[PDB]
Amino acid sequence: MEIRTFLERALKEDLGHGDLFERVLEKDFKATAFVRAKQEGVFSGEKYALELLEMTGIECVQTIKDKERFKPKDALMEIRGDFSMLLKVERTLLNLLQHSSGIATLTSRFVEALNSHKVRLLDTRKTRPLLRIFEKYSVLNGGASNHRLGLDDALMLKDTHLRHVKDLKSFLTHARKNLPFTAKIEIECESFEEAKNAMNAGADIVMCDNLSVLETKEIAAYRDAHYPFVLLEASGNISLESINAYAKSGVDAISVGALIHQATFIDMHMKMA
Amino acid sequence: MEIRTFLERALKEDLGHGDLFERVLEKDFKATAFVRAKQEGVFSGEKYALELLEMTGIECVQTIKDKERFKPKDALMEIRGDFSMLLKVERTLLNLLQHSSGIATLTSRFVEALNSHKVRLLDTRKTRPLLRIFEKYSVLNGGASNHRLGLDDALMLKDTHLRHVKDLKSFLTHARKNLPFTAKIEIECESFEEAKNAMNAGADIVMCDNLSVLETKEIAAYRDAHYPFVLLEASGNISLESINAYAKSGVDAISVGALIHQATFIDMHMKMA
Amino acid sequence: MEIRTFLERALKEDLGHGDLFERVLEKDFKATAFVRAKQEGVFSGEKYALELLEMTGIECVQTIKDKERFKPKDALMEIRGDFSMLLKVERTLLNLLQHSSGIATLTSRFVEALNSHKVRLLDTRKTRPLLRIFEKYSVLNGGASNHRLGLDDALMLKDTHLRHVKDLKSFLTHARKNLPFTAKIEIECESFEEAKNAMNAGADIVMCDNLSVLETKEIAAYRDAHYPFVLLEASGNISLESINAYAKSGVDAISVGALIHQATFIDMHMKMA
Amino acid sequence: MEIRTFLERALKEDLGHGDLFERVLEKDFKATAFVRAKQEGVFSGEKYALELLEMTGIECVQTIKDKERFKPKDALMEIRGDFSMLLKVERTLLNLLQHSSGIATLTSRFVEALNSHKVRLLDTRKTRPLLRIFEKYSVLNGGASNHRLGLDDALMLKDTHLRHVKDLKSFLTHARKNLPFTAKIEIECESFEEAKNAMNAGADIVMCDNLSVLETKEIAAYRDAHYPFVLLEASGNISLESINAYAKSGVDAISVGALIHQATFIDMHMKMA
Amino acid sequence: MEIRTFLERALKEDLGHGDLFERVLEKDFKATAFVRAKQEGVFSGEKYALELLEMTGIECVQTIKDKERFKPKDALMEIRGDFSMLLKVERTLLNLLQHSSGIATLTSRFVEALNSHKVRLLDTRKTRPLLRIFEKYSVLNGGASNHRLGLDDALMLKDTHLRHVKDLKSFLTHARKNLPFTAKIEIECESFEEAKNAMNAGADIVMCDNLSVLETKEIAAYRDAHYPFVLLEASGNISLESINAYAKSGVDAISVGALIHQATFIDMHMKMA
Amino acid sequence: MEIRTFLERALKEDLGHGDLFERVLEKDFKATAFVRAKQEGVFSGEKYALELLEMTGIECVQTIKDKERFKPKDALMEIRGDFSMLLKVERTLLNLLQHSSGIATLTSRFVEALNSHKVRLLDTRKTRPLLRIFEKYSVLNGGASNHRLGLDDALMLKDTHLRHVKDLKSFLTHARKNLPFTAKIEIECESFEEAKNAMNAGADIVMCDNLSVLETKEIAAYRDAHYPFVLLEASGNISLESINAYAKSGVDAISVGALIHQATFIDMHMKMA
Numbered sequence A, B, C, D, E, F: 001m002e003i004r005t006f007l008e009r010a011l012k013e014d015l016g017h018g019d020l021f022e023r024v025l026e027k028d029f030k031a032t033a034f035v036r037a038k039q040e041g042v043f044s045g046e047k048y049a050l051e052l053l054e055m056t057g058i059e060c061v062q063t064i065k066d067k068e069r070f071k072p073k074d075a076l077m078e079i080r081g082d083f084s085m086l087l088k089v090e091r092t093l094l095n096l097l098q099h100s101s102g103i104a105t106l107t108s109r110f111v112e113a114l115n116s117h118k119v120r121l122l123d124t125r126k127t128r129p130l131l132r133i134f135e136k137y138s139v140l141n142g143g144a145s146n147h148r149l150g151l152d153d154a155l156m157l158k159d160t161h162l163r164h165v166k167d168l169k170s171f172l173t174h175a176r177k178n179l180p181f182t183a184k185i186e187i188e189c190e191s192f193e194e195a196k197n198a199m200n201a202g203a204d205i206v207m208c209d210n211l212s213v214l215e216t217k218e219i220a221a222y223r224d225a226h227y228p229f230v231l232l233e234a235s236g237n238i239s240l241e242s243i244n245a246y247a248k249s250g251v252d253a254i255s256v257g258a259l260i261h262q263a264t265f266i267d268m269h270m271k272m273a
Ligand SMILES: O=C(O)c1ccccc1C(=O)O
Pocket: A123, A124, A125, A126, A147, A148, A156, A235, A255, B091
């Protein structure tokens, strides 16, 4: 399976040479445990939690679903298995859920402020080492959308790359054959002119980077007049207090890396009840 | 190397099938790039950064060290190598330094508020999946100390465990020969009575879990009168606004997991020329 | 590096417990060897060959380049290193070059018959186990283009998927948010009607699957009239004797899986000269 | 299992970051699919197919066996499982069976042309990277035999080696104690004289590399008169139109690497309902 | 699980390219076998054996348990599975059990001659490569106790480490904020004057390296005068003929690496029947 | 390389989470150490040691070589590197050399008591888990010879395998087309009447299992009457006090697993200075 290795390594990291408690534990036995919330939020990590449990021979009697909301004291999952194994898994199972739900919850906040069904909230490639896929999955459970998953996923050209491209329209036209047939090219822009030249150069997507709502709005309109099939994305240090204003500019999407890199853990815990 | 694989995994996740730009960059060349700050903070991730650069074939001309403070606009690292590799490694490098430094910086604020040279600040086993060692290393670079690194490091018995241990003293006595000779045992207590009976049980370390400063002083005092070689640790949602008060409690260490799980990325970016 | 693991496993597979010859070999010594051609063709596998040599401490004095043509008796590479290691690497190094150049050469034939710079020749996801990336790279060196590299690369819907989609236009419109922001959706069609409905449904690409040149031509024209930004691909059992005719229908690309699955080894060998 | 990892690698390469359809398939369900033929041929890959299906959680209702012949339109396998997994595994399964069967079928035509029950047909160490064991297994399913599987299997000295061995007899004599007790030694010869002196040197097997049938009979005869326990093998661009002639040469085996490196995919496809 | 990788690798080394018998066997059938002893000793390796059979298909019908004594002829295990898999696992099963029991048994003889319950037998970091966890687990089954399991488990300082500092006091006092909070510091000493310094330094344990019983007692008693909590261990060489002598010297533990680095296999064997 | 993975894993088991000393050390410096012997024996493991130091940074200044004899006090290796890396590698370096030399040396004593050059000493498939290649390599360094290295190396039939067929003749005659062309078939026998059948069956080797010298000679001589080429091996138990006796029995080899499964470490140690 796609994430069985992820969980093995998550786990491996915690018990190193071997769990000391399992050595001292007099007799083992089947026990039931519950994962309870200590905060409110959106639950994320279900897919990873079931694989971890499966992986370790722990049964999953009950669980809420990946996009469900919850209040503190809510039981999130009811698991049953060896006492020794519930303990060896506990922190891994909880770090998983707490981290992942933290992102879904922070993300849900933005989706909320955004308030629009026509405009999409996107994440970024700013993720923590080894958690690209894990965190991207989290953002989804919060109610938003994912941007490309990597550098193989699509071509994104910004100032760094552009500074060395003599003729952009020429470059894009002739790059298409050295890129897979299905790839889209996106050009990051910092002005209306740049955006205009990008659309005419052949871009499939233009990123209005660090531009006022007015600026963006102008670009959005121009795209509507000419290049109606080119996609527009607004990006920059967009805050919760800033998102709604941008959703009205006409861009198709808004990306805020903070959805992942500014998210923190939600409080949960395991009761052997 | 120890963290060699870690760095390979972080990279793979990002280029997947292969970086696309690399396919269209007509002519590759050596270039220099700078990792600049956009926020003040404590630098962390040097050990990883340097290993990433080396296995990647990029040279490190200059770089500040693992604990230096810095302010916006400051140049943190100067690297040189193939243009194509600089771009392929960019996000991995930054995400790495921004995440590691975020934790160090956050920890930094607790080390100050704590304000002590006798009471050490510790982390927890609450760490993001696959980033334990990474996040623990990060905490060290903020000026604090580390707690055990795993379930193999030492034996820590809490509520769940204790509910099945009827006679501690005896349990702890006979547990010794089944643990590695060097292991220490720690017991979480939520009342003066629990701590007192843990000390008498033969505990090496006692945790004062969610107790007023007064409550804690009481245990600290008792430990000094009798049981002078038992380490006391206080923990329990200990905020930035209360650690200092707890530092005066008379404890040896104060553990706050938020140093890691409530930390966020420090703004940083890579710039050519 | 991206393909260092590929080569380790290629190699590992050949010497199993350990090369027997290196046991019996009296004295080792630096020797020079040449990879010579025994057929004509396009050379492919340079990127993999240099990594293998590097990996095993073999120097690469000279080599032709990945898209260069060659006649039999041509020296392709001049390598130098331990006699024992040249022998342990020989077959791996040659299977690499022979297989990879076999694909580039068969591919070059199609590019030739195609005779067009406006139309692109694409491969498919029909590759040999564990060689997806290796073979895709080969097709490029033959002078053609790659189709998506996998199922994460782009969405491709065909009869199998469509049979369960009530309203296609609705499905595509609402799928966009659950797919990364940069993904393109392609619909495989087996009639002019299907193609027409696909473009109107919202597809970014339509595949004219198993359609006469006339059929294709009709679809190509319609796309030009309406939906000028939708991409067209002709596919099916297109033969060398059939490609040129299709290149004149108006489609943007033609894909033939045979480029990879009908390619065979080119004759080469290593002379210790 | 032995081929467990192999199958994991093949799959990973295909879904990379994750299958996209899976993201948009609104409702998953169990379904049945058939693997049908579009060409006549010999079936191969059952061992791999079944392991792929099992680790993938797909059931195998029916399947023909590893050596059965088949014709177009024939249903080769009947499988059942989640719709989403059937689609994610489709290409990997087919590519696997089409490649394995291609080799078996091609080998099949040589086994016939050879037409003998005393002379066995062998493959070579010329196999596509990472597919050695896979391709060798495939050859077995065509009705032929396998040569050694690697450089550890046995010791085969050819031109390159021999140019540095001045006194074979002596070399072979003292080589024995440095090889594993069970190893056999083989020596490639390109003339009656070379073979004769190899036999006398103490060779277990002699290869008649690129020699007329007459030339070979000469060596075969000599081997029968003296050295009756030495295995003779003939090889050297031995085509489908000459093996039979060589079978009568008096050799024990005829090796042709093209059984693997000139084989191509057998047309096959997966169909629901 | 935790040692499933260990077993895959073990089994991987024996079969390599693939077991030859299975290519010969006509029809496979389910058969039973018995791991029977041919010598007297203490059984060990039940944990790995059961995991090996499970991940390998073979069914475990009956088995004595870790730490149970046995005599020649005794049947230690009864397994059930395919004729081929039993033959393929046989060697790997026995090597585990024999090497493991070999260490348990030799350990039990030191345990026996130690004759004490206030003193425990320890092992060392002197283990065969890749087998530490395996061999440490084997010692426990002999009835003794394990020492730390690696350099991450605890800090063990000796001359080479301390060659150079002036303080032990401050060195140790400051090494504390750099070690995980729960880690102990043991110091190896060679003279009373040394052990004396360690205790005044702040050590948590002291090793009396190959000293005399009269030398040890001086320290044992001194340890009681003050520093009643600091543990004492003192084997440097010790032997069966000298363990007991030390047990009555006043130390808490006696480590002897020979329990592992001097153990040899126990005769066992698998018989179908 | 081929055993670089072996070393990474070995070193990985010792440090785990990370060496503790390095978290304490103030300033690291380059230092020298000497692997000195404390016992007499035959050196082995030069191959792994040099690879371990290289991949680990430490520089190898001087070293005796595989198969060279040494006495107590003798300096076997002189290494140069960082103080930390030497301490971190020490244990892992010695365990390799000691366990390896331990096997070489014990093997050399059997070689010595065998006193023959027309008869070679073999080892068995009785090796510690994960150490076969290592231990087989260690025997060679003792001056003896290795047997097959696994079940893929050759086919070795005994009662359990043959319990059931009627023919050996046809069984073997047909097992040939299913085994790689270069593979040998050895048959273990327990009585003249058995070895007699094997030769008439077509065996390539025959093992005289724990028989008497008079029993062996009957077969040795018989082997000469007819079947001069089929090799003979005959140890079943053999010992130092009985090897020579067999060497003069007429067999080509004498295998004794005890060379490995009875070897113990050789005393060595690392000293800074
Ligand atoms: O990380 C970025 O620079 C980034 C920012 C916004 C959207 C997309 C990306 C991306 O690279 O995928």
